[PDB]
Amino acid sequence: GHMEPAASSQAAVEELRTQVRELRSIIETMKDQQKREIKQLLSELDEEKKIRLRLQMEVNDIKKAL
Amino acid sequence: GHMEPAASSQAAVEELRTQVRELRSIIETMKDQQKREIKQLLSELDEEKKIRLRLQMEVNDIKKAL
């Protein structure tokens, strides 16, 4: 898709206003998407920590039985 | 809060200049905040790796004693 820039100064200002509103939206969206990815990675890390802590309890039980 | 856009072309250009300076700031801020979150997650991961490596040394000691 492709449209010529306005030549009229007022029209050009209004187009730039629109592009500023669009860039504000893009910034917010890709911040949210990045937040979501990080929280998924955190959830995966914390599950690993939980599983490893259970293994440690299993190893400690084994040491009792030696 | 709400203020009408300037009608004068020069005033409108100067407002858009201001909004561009403000968007540059927002971009930098939310990049830094995202960096900080990632480095905290990395610190948590590396501590886990350290703890797991210690468990491995404990398991290896146990194997000696069998």
Next chain:
Amino acid sequence: GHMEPAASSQAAVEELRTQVRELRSIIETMKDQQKREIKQLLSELDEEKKIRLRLQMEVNDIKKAL
């Protein structure tokens, strides 16, 4: 580096157009860099998970031999 803003309205509009094209580029770049950092952290997490799962298999072998 430092250059005075254009005074002419059309020239000023064209400068602001340029800065909008530059901010679009900065946004994309720092999104990609942030993506790259996250995927490296994910690779490190998944390797840890792999190593821990191997330790669990080693512990389970030890339990057989008790």
